[PDB]
Amino acid sequence: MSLTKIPENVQGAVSIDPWLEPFADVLSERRYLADKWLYDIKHATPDGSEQSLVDFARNAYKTYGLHANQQTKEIVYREWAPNAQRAFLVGEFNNWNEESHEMKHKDEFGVFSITLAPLENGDFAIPHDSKIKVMFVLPDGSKVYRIPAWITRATQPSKETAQKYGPTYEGRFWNPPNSYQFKHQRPKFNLANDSIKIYEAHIGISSPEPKVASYKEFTQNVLPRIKHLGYDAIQLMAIMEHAYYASFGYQVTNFFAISSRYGTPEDLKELIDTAHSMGILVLLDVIHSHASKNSEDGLNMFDGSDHQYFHSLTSGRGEHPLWDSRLFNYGSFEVQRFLLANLAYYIDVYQFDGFRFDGVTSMLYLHHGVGVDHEALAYLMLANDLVHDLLPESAVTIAEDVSGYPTLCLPRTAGGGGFDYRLAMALPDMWIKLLKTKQDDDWDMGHIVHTLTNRRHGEKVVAYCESHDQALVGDKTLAFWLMDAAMYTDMTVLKEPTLVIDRGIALHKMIRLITHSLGGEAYLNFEGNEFGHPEWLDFPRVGNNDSYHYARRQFNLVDDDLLRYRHLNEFDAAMQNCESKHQWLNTPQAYVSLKHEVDKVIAFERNGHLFVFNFHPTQSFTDYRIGVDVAGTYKIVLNTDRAEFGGHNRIDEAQEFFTTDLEWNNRRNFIQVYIPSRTAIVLTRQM
Numbered sequence: 212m213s214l215t216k217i218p219e220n221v222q223g224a225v226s227i228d229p230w231l232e233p234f235a236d237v238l239s240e241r242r243y244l245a246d247k248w249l250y251d252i253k254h255a256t257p258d259g260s261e262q263s264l265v266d267f268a269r270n271a272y273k274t275y276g277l278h279a280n281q282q283t284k285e286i287v288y289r290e291w292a293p294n295a296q297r298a299f300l301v302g303e304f305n306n307w308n309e310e311s312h313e314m315k316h317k318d319e320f321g322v323f324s325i326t327l328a329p330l331e332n333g334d335f336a337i338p339h340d341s342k343i344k345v346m347f348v349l350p351d352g353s354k355v356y357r358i359p360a361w362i363t364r365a366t367q368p369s370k371e372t373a374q375k376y377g378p379t380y381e382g383r384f385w386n387p388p389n390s391y392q393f394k395h396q397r398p399k400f401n402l403a404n405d406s407i408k409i410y411e412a413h414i415g416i417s418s419p420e421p422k423v424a425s426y427k428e429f430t431q432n433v434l435p436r437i438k439h440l441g442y443d444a445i446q447l448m449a450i451m452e453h454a455y456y457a458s459f460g461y462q463v464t465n466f467f468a469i470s471s472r473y474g475t476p477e478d479l480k481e482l483i484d485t486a487h488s489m490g491i492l493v494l495l496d497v498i499h500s501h502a503s504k505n506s507e508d509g510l511n512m513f514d515g516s517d518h519q520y521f522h523s524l525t526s527g528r529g530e531h532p533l534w535d536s537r538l539f540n541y542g543s544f545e546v547q548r549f550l551l552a553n554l555a556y557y558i559d560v561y562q563f564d565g566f567r568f569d570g571v572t573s574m575l576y577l578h579h580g581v582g583v584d585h586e587a588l589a590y591l592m593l594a595n596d597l598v599h600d601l602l603p604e605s606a607v608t609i610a611e612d613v614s615g616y617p618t619l620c621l622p623r624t625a626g627g628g629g630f631d632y633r634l635a636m637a638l639p640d641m642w643i644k645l646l647k648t649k650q651d652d653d654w655d656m657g658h659i660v661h662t663l664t665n666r667r668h669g670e671k672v673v674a675y676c677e678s679h680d681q682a683l684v685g686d687k688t689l690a691f692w693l694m695d696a697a698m699y700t701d702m703t704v705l706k707e708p709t710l711v712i713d714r715g716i717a718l719h720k721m722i723r724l725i726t727h728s729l730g731g732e733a734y735l736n737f738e739g740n741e742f743g744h745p746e747w748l749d750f751p752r753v754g755n756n757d758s759y760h761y762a763r764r765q766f767n768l769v770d771d772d773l774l775r776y777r778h779l780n781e782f783d784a785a786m787q788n789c790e791s792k793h794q795w796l797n798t799p800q801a802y803v804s805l806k807h808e809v810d811k812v813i814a815f816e817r818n819g820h821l822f823v824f825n826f827h828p829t830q831s832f833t834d835y836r837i838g839v840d841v842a843g844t845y846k847i848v849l850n851t852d853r854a855e856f857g858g859h860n861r862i863d864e865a866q867e868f869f870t871t872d873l874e875w876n877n878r879r880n881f882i883q884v885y886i887p888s889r890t891a892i893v894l895t896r897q898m
């Protein structure tokens with residue numbers, strides 16, 4: 212007879228999706244843990260009074276780590292190491308003397324501290340960009356050496372240093388005479404109202420050369436290409452320091468160090484400032500789901516113990532079943548401080564505009580996606596509180612969550628995780644299965660529409676037809692599925708394309724456009740796929756003889772107006788700029804009027820604009836009737852068949868499309884369109 216219990220702190224979510232009703236109590240407990248931790252954090256002040264969550268995070272990165280005082284020329288260094296009996300700062304600055312610079316004060320928190328006076332001549336005691344370590348003496352008397360956990364730069368060893376010590380990274384004290392000063396404002400952006408179209412990029416591979424390309428090169432040579440394409444945002448992968456390049460950035464060693472293989476912190480600041488000057492937001496891949504198992508240059512056994520940053524190996528909760536990585540103890544207050552400060556550091560010091568949290572499925576579940584892990588979810592809820600407080604109404608957070616955890620992207624006040632978007636990570640496999648298993652005459656229009664529109668209510672989605680995952684050596688891109696190993700001989704504009712190439716180009720544009728318009732509330736493109744980049748991506752590793760041959764991006768292809776890669780590129784630019792003028796991404800789901808299984812025609816309206824796709828492999832249609840709700844005059848604003856997009860220029864884009872007041876496909880009006888085989892068009896109503 213008991214009333215079904217719907218606690219007030221998840222009423223918002225339950226109203227959004229009443230399917231959640233039988234889970235309301237477990238959802239309420241999940242939020243409640245996060246809300247109690249939030250209270251704990253906001254009262255972690257000397258007198259126990261309330262502080263803001265932002266102030267907590269900012270005070271943390273301003274007081275942990277090493278800080279040079281530019282006025283007094285002192286240096287302060289503090290380091291959390293509860294298991295260590297003694298701590299010493301060693302480095303080039305003191306010829307690695309293990310006695311002269313003890314961090315004598317160990318506080319109630321287990322934090323060692325030291326202040327270094329200026330030198331007799333007034334110089335900083337630690338030279339700019341010289342090497343440092345902290346040495347701990349453990350209770351048993353043994354010694355271990357570590358890169359400080361909050362170091363802002365860590366570099367690969369020289370050939371000689373690695374001959375004597377191995378590949379272990381070296382910590383650097385970064386204190387340049389002239390820090391980069393930001394000159395440009397963040398672009399105007401309202402998360403609730405504005406569309407975000409995301410260019411996913413990796414600095415190291417961003418040149419045609421088989422090398423690690425630099426921050427400066429990206430700023431000079433790639434940013435203009437992204438501006439030309441009209442993307443709203445760049446998602447920078449592999450920025451947090453990682454010693455193993457082929458990890459793609461996912462094995463993080465130094466959480467507060469931007470990767471040094473691409474250049475200096477000031478080079479990356481300039482990169483982000485320049486993106487901002489061009490109106491482009493910059494997002495960071497944040498890997499807070501696990502850490503590299505490296506000791507000394509990583510956090511594993513940092514203080515000599517197996518229960519500081521990570522759940523212990525004997526707890527059964529301490530290592531990943533596949534990644535060979537350690538798992539954070541999110542219930543430790545100092546680990547919460549470390550991770551939350553890390554987010555504020557990247558927003559504040561580098562002016563990133565938001566984050567993509569990688570590994571969210573591994574965080575959410577006690578078995579990591581092969582029961583929910585309440586502590587990891589509560590940390591993500593705090594993380595969203597903080598990021599949205601740092602940049603109110605502008606900040607973006609995005610979850611990489613393959614599981615589709617309900618409420619992940621509902622607001623925290625509703626009882627949800629607080630993410631703005633999740634990745635639509637099932638969508639690439641739909642396109643691969645069609646291309647690999649079904650003949651073209653056998654494409655099911657309804658199954659395409661169902662998969663693209665199957666989105667949880669209220670949980671906004673970044674759609675894409677392929678991502679950095681699929682570009683990798685494990686799989687083939689859409690370009691490879693559609694055109695195999697096509698070469699410059701197949702891609703010349705000076706001869707008629709084969710059937711294969713003609714079909715590949717048309718579908719490459721059509722698949723992107725229907726994903727972009729029907730599949731989500733935001734869009735993502737992985738670097739190179741906007742122009743159908745050939746071959747595949749691969750990083751140097753043992754399995755390929757440390758080759759960089761595939762660790763690059765042939766951007767030169769786009770500049771050759773006698774090849775067809777540029778046709779794909781120009782269409783991508785047209786798609787993004789069309790959406791910028793005629794919003795359809797961050798809008799309610801489409802109203803689909805047609806998914807015709809014999810004609811292979813899909814038609815829908817979204818945000819008042821009309822979208823028509825003829826997927827039929829051979830049949831062209833003339834005077835094809837399309838239902839339209841709002842009567843008026845329509846004009847084509849995007850046309851896949853245009854010559855400069857690599858089409859055959861059959862469609863007259865000057866034509867005025869007048870509606871006729873006669874019911875059709877459950878709409879009050881119709882227009883009539885010419886749609887050749889494998890073409891698509893977008894129309895908007897003229898005012």
Ligand SMILES: OC[C@H]1O[C@H](O[C@H]2[C@H](O)[C@@H](O)[C@@H](O[C@H]3[C@H](O)[C@@H](O)[C@@H](O)O[C@@H]3CO)O[C@@H]2CO)[C@H](O)[C@@H](O)[C@@H]1O
Pocket residue numbers: 306307344356376507
């Ligand atoms: O001491 C100067 C020399 O070493 C510097 O730091 C190292 C320590 O001094 C050193 O004791 C070292 O300990 C290593 C062991 O000797 C060795 O067996 C190795 O295999 O494991 C330990 C590595 O941690 O620890 C540090 C390493 O940074 C500095 O690195 C050198 O540039 C300097 O020439």
